[PDB]
Amino acid sequence: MNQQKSLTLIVALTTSYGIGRSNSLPWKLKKEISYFKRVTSFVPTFDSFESMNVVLMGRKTWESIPLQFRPLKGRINVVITRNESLDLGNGIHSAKSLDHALELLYRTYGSESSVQINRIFVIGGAQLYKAAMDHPKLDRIMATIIYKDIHCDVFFPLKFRDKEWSSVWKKEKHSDLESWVGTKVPHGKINEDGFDYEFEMWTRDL
Protein backbone atom coordinates (compact mmCIF):
# COMPACT_ATOMS: atom_id res chain seq x y z
CA MET A 1 0.00 0.00 0.00
CA ASN A 2 2.14 2.91 -1.22
CA GLN A 3 2.98 3.05 -4.92
CA GLN A 4 0.72 1.53 -7.55
CA LYS A 5 0.02 4.18 -10.18
CA SER A 6 2.49 6.42 -11.95
CA LEU A 7 3.31 10.03 -11.08
CA THR A 8 2.92 12.70 -13.78
CA LEU A 9 4.60 16.09 -13.29
CA ILE A 10 3.20 19.21 -14.95
CA VAL A 11 5.00 22.49 -15.41
CA ALA A 12 5.39 25.69 -17.33
CA LEU A 13 9.05 26.58 -17.62
CA THR A 14 11.20 28.76 -19.86
CA THR A 15 14.03 27.42 -22.01
CA SER A 16 16.40 28.04 -19.05
CA TYR A 17 14.31 26.04 -16.51
CA GLY A 18 12.81 29.05 -14.78
CA ILE A 19 9.42 28.16 -13.31
CA GLY A 20 8.64 31.12 -11.01
CA ARG A 21 9.77 34.49 -9.67
CA SER A 22 9.26 35.91 -6.21
CA ASN A 23 7.14 32.98 -5.07
CA SER A 24 4.85 33.73 -8.04
CA LEU A 25 4.14 33.15 -11.74
CA PRO A 26 5.82 35.91 -13.70
CA TRP A 27 3.51 35.47 -16.67
CA LYS A 28 -0.16 35.54 -17.65
CA LEU A 29 -0.79 32.48 -19.81
CA LYS A 30 -4.57 32.23 -19.44
CA LYS A 31 -4.93 29.58 -22.16
CA GLU A 32 -1.82 27.95 -20.72
CA ILE A 33 -3.79 27.75 -17.43
CA SER A 34 -6.72 26.21 -19.36
CA TYR A 35 -4.45 23.50 -20.68
CA PHE A 36 -3.52 22.92 -17.08
CA LYS A 37 -7.12 22.81 -15.87
CA ARG A 38 -8.01 20.66 -18.86
CA VAL A 39 -5.17 18.20 -18.33
CA THR A 40 -5.51 17.91 -14.57
CA SER A 41 -9.27 17.30 -14.68
CA PHE A 42 -9.50 14.86 -17.60
CA VAL A 43 -10.98 11.50 -16.72
CA PRO A 44 -12.16 9.01 -19.39
CA THR A 45 -15.93 9.25 -19.67
CA PHE A 46 -16.73 5.66 -18.75
CA ASP A 47 -14.66 6.34 -15.64
CA SER A 48 -16.01 9.91 -15.43
CA PHE A 49 -18.46 8.36 -12.98
CA GLU A 50 -16.44 7.29 -9.91
CA SER A 51 -12.94 8.52 -10.80
CA MET A 52 -11.01 11.67 -9.97
CA ASN A 53 -7.47 12.91 -10.54
CA VAL A 54 -5.10 13.99 -7.75
CA VAL A 55 -3.03 17.22 -7.81
CA LEU A 56 -0.01 17.30 -5.49
CA MET A 57 1.52 20.68 -4.58
CA GLY A 58 4.00 22.10 -2.07
CA ARG A 59 2.74 24.59 0.56
CA LYS A 60 3.91 27.61 -1.43
CA THR A 61 2.04 26.71 -4.62
CA TRP A 62 -1.06 26.34 -2.50
CA GLU A 63 -0.64 29.94 -1.30
CA SER A 64 -0.29 30.93 -4.96
CA ILE A 65 -3.77 29.64 -5.84
CA PRO A 66 -6.24 32.50 -5.78
CA LEU A 67 -8.76 32.01 -2.99
CA GLN A 68 -11.14 32.06 -5.89
CA PHE A 69 -9.59 28.92 -7.35
CA ARG A 70 -8.96 26.87 -4.21
CA PRO A 71 -9.16 23.97 -3.90
CA LEU A 72 -8.88 23.09 -7.57
CA LYS A 73 -12.39 22.00 -8.58
CA GLY A 74 -12.95 18.47 -9.93
CA ARG A 75 -9.65 17.26 -8.42
CA ILE A 76 -8.41 15.85 -5.12
CA ASN A 77 -5.78 18.25 -3.76
CA VAL A 78 -3.01 17.20 -1.37
CA VAL A 79 -0.61 19.82 0.01
CA ILE A 80 2.83 18.40 0.96
CA THR A 81 3.81 19.97 4.28
CA ARG A 82 6.03 18.93 7.18
CA ASN A 83 5.18 22.16 8.89
CA GLU A 84 1.59 21.13 9.09
CA SER A 85 0.36 22.81 12.28
CA LEU A 86 -3.17 22.86 11.03
CA ASP A 87 -3.93 22.98 7.32
CA LEU A 88 -7.25 24.75 6.65
CA GLY A 89 -9.58 23.00 4.22
CA ASN A 90 -12.75 20.95 4.12
CA GLY A 91 -11.36 17.81 2.52
CA ILE A 92 -7.99 19.20 1.53
CA HIS A 93 -5.48 16.72 2.80
CA SER A 94 -2.07 17.44 4.23
CA ALA A 95 0.68 14.82 3.90
CA LYS A 96 4.18 15.25 5.38
CA SER A 97 5.90 14.08 2.20
CA LEU A 98 5.27 12.66 -1.26
CA ASP A 99 5.05 9.01 -0.17
CA HIS A 100 2.97 9.87 2.87
CA ALA A 101 0.68 11.74 0.52
CA LEU A 102 0.54 8.59 -1.58
CA GLU A 103 -0.51 6.24 1.28
CA LEU A 104 -3.06 8.72 2.57
CA LEU A 105 -4.92 8.66 -0.76
CA TYR A 106 -4.37 4.93 -1.07
CA ARG A 107 -5.59 4.68 2.53
CA THR A 108 -8.36 7.30 2.33
CA TYR A 109 -9.50 6.42 -1.22
CA GLY A 110 -9.70 2.65 -1.80
CA SER A 111 -12.30 0.01 -2.68
CA GLU A 112 -14.48 1.19 0.21
CA SER A 113 -14.76 4.67 -1.32
CA SER A 114 -17.44 5.70 -3.84
CA VAL A 115 -14.57 7.89 -4.97
CA GLN A 116 -11.64 6.57 -6.86
CA ILE A 117 -8.54 8.04 -8.39
CA ASN A 118 -7.40 7.76 -11.98
CA ARG A 119 -4.39 10.08 -12.18
CA ILE A 120 -2.03 11.72 -9.73
CA PHE A 121 -0.17 14.93 -10.65
CA VAL A 122 2.69 16.85 -9.07
CA ILE A 123 1.69 20.44 -9.98
CA GLY A 124 4.66 22.05 -8.20
CA GLY A 125 6.62 23.89 -7.12
CA ALA A 126 10.38 23.67 -7.01
CA GLN A 127 11.05 21.48 -3.97
CA LEU A 128 8.10 19.18 -4.66
CA TYR A 129 9.36 18.85 -8.22
CA LYS A 130 12.73 17.74 -6.81
CA ALA A 131 11.32 14.84 -4.76
CA ALA A 132 9.02 13.84 -7.64
CA MET A 133 12.09 13.64 -9.84
CA ASP A 134 13.88 11.21 -7.45
CA HIS A 135 10.72 9.13 -6.81
CA PRO A 136 10.85 5.78 -8.58
CA LYS A 137 7.24 6.19 -9.88
CA LEU A 138 7.73 9.40 -11.86
CA ASP A 139 7.74 8.59 -15.59
CA ARG A 140 5.99 11.42 -17.39
CA ILE A 141 6.61 15.14 -17.72
CA MET A 142 3.74 17.23 -19.04
CA ALA A 143 5.76 20.40 -19.69
CA THR A 144 4.88 23.68 -21.33
CA ILE A 145 7.90 25.50 -22.78
CA ILE A 146 8.03 29.28 -23.06
CA TYR A 147 10.45 30.60 -25.67
CA LYS A 148 11.14 33.71 -23.63
CA ASP A 149 13.90 34.34 -21.09
CA ILE A 150 11.73 35.48 -18.18
CA HIS A 151 13.74 36.34 -15.11
CA CYS A 152 12.82 33.63 -12.62
CA ASP A 153 14.08 33.17 -9.04
CA VAL A 154 13.18 29.42 -8.86
CA PHE A 155 14.32 26.77 -11.30
CA PHE A 156 13.21 23.29 -12.22
CA PRO A 157 15.40 20.67 -10.50
CA LEU A 158 16.44 18.44 -13.47
CA LYS A 159 17.46 19.61 -16.93
CA PHE A 160 15.41 16.78 -18.48
CA ARG A 161 15.35 18.20 -22.00
CA ASP A 162 19.15 18.48 -22.19
CA LYS A 163 21.47 16.03 -23.90
CA GLU A 164 22.85 14.70 -20.60
CA TRP A 165 19.45 13.18 -19.81
CA SER A 166 18.56 12.26 -23.40
CA SER A 167 18.80 8.52 -22.79
CA VAL A 168 16.13 8.59 -20.06
CA TRP A 169 13.75 11.32 -21.01
CA LYS A 170 12.22 11.22 -24.44
CA LYS A 171 9.79 13.64 -25.91
CA GLU A 172 6.79 11.75 -27.30
CA LYS A 173 4.94 12.29 -30.61
CA HIS A 174 2.28 15.05 -30.61
CA SER A 175 -0.04 12.13 -31.23
CA ASP A 176 0.93 10.39 -28.00
CA LEU A 177 0.35 13.59 -26.00
CA GLU A 178 -3.15 14.25 -27.34
CA SER A 179 -4.22 10.62 -26.86
CA TRP A 180 -2.94 10.66 -23.27
CA VAL A 181 -4.66 13.98 -22.55
CA GLY A 182 -7.53 12.36 -24.40
CA THR A 183 -8.45 15.61 -26.21
CA LYS A 184 -6.74 17.39 -29.16
CA VAL A 185 -4.15 20.04 -28.30
CA PRO A 186 -2.46 22.85 -30.23
CA HIS A 187 0.54 21.63 -32.18
CA GLY A 188 3.36 24.15 -32.78
CA LYS A 189 3.77 27.42 -30.93
CA ILE A 190 1.06 29.43 -29.19
CA ASN A 191 1.64 33.19 -28.80
CA GLU A 192 -0.32 34.66 -25.92
CA ASP A 193 0.35 38.24 -24.96
CA GLY A 194 4.10 38.32 -25.58
CA PHE A 195 5.42 34.81 -24.79
CA ASP A 196 5.97 32.04 -27.32
CA TYR A 197 5.16 28.64 -25.82
CA GLU A 198 4.41 25.04 -26.51
CA PHE A 199 3.27 21.76 -24.98
CA GLU A 200 5.41 18.63 -24.65
CA MET A 201 5.23 15.16 -23.10
CA TRP A 202 8.52 13.67 -21.87
CA THR A 203 8.50 10.01 -20.70
CA ARG A 204 11.05 7.73 -18.99
CA ASP A 205 11.30 3.97 -18.41
CA LEU A 206 11.03 3.23 -14.67
Ligand SMILES: NC(=O)C1=CN([C@@H]2O[C@H](COP(=O)(O)OP(=O)(O)OC[C@H]3O[C@@H](n4cnc5c(N)ncnc54)[C@H](OP(=O)(O)O)[C@@H]3O)[C@@H](O)[C@H]2O)C=CC1
Ligand atom coordinates in the same frame (compact mmCIF):
# COMPACT_ATOMS: atom_id res chain seq x y z
N1 LIG B 1 5.84 26.51 -13.33
C1 LIG B 1 4.99 25.90 -12.49
O1 LIG B 1 4.14 25.10 -12.85
C2 LIG B 1 5.00 26.14 -11.01
C3 LIG B 1 5.89 26.99 -10.48
N2 LIG B 1 5.85 27.18 -9.06
C4 LIG B 1 6.78 28.16 -8.33
O2 LIG B 1 7.69 27.47 -7.42
C5 LIG B 1 8.03 28.46 -6.36
C6 LIG B 1 7.76 27.78 -5.01
O3 LIG B 1 8.78 26.76 -5.08
P1 LIG B 1 9.08 26.11 -3.82
O4 LIG B 1 9.61 27.26 -3.07
O5 LIG B 1 9.90 24.96 -3.87
O6 LIG B 1 7.60 25.91 -3.28
P2 LIG B 1 6.70 24.63 -3.18
O7 LIG B 1 5.31 25.03 -3.57
O8 LIG B 1 7.31 23.37 -3.60
O9 LIG B 1 6.59 24.69 -1.49
C7 LIG B 1 7.73 24.05 -0.78
C8 LIG B 1 7.12 23.86 0.64
O10 LIG B 1 6.30 22.91 0.57
C9 LIG B 1 6.59 21.76 1.38
N3 LIG B 1 7.38 20.77 0.70
C10 LIG B 1 7.74 20.82 -0.60
N4 LIG B 1 8.48 19.80 -0.97
C11 LIG B 1 8.57 19.09 0.28
C12 LIG B 1 9.29 17.76 0.69
N5 LIG B 1 9.97 17.08 -0.23
N6 LIG B 1 9.17 17.36 1.98
C13 LIG B 1 8.43 18.18 2.75
N7 LIG B 1 7.80 19.31 2.52
C14 LIG B 1 7.91 19.69 1.23
C15 LIG B 1 7.38 22.49 2.51
O11 LIG B 1 6.50 23.28 3.19
P3 LIG B 1 6.90 23.67 4.82
O12 LIG B 1 7.40 25.06 4.75
O13 LIG B 1 5.67 23.27 5.47
O14 LIG B 1 8.06 22.71 5.06
C16 LIG B 1 8.33 23.29 1.58
O15 LIG B 1 8.80 24.58 2.19
C17 LIG B 1 7.22 29.76 -6.64
O16 LIG B 1 8.02 30.60 -7.54
C18 LIG B 1 6.01 29.12 -7.40
O17 LIG B 1 5.33 30.09 -8.09
C19 LIG B 1 4.92 26.53 -8.25
C20 LIG B 1 4.03 25.68 -8.73
C21 LIG B 1 3.93 25.36 -10.19
Ligand SMILES: CN(Cc1coc2nc(N)nc(N)c12)c1ccc(C(=O)N[C@@H](CCC(=O)O)C(=O)O)cc1
Ligand atom coordinates in the same frame (compact mmCIF):
# COMPACT_ATOMS: atom_id res chain seq x y z
C1 LIG C 1 1.05 28.16 -9.53
N1 LIG C 1 0.21 27.06 -10.07
C2 LIG C 1 0.91 26.19 -11.03
C3 LIG C 1 0.77 26.36 -12.51
C4 LIG C 1 0.33 27.35 -13.28
O1 LIG C 1 0.37 27.09 -14.49
C5 LIG C 1 0.84 25.97 -14.65
N2 LIG C 1 1.01 25.39 -15.85
C6 LIG C 1 1.53 24.16 -15.76
N3 LIG C 1 1.75 23.56 -16.91
N4 LIG C 1 1.82 23.59 -14.65
C7 LIG C 1 1.67 24.14 -13.50
N5 LIG C 1 1.99 23.49 -12.38
C8 LIG C 1 1.15 25.37 -13.51
C9 LIG C 1 -1.11 27.22 -10.21
C10 LIG C 1 -1.67 28.39 -9.87
C11 LIG C 1 -2.98 28.64 -10.02
C12 LIG C 1 -3.80 27.70 -10.52
C13 LIG C 1 -5.12 27.90 -10.71
O2 LIG C 1 -5.77 28.77 -10.15
N6 LIG C 1 -5.83 27.12 -11.56
C14 LIG C 1 -7.28 27.24 -11.18
C15 LIG C 1 -7.79 28.61 -11.69
C16 LIG C 1 -8.84 28.61 -12.80
C17 LIG C 1 -8.53 29.60 -13.90
O3 LIG C 1 -7.72 30.49 -13.70
O4 LIG C 1 -9.10 29.47 -14.97
C18 LIG C 1 -8.00 26.02 -11.65
O5 LIG C 1 -9.13 25.74 -11.25
O6 LIG C 1 -7.48 25.19 -12.40
C19 LIG C 1 -3.24 26.52 -10.89
C20 LIG C 1 -1.94 26.29 -10.72
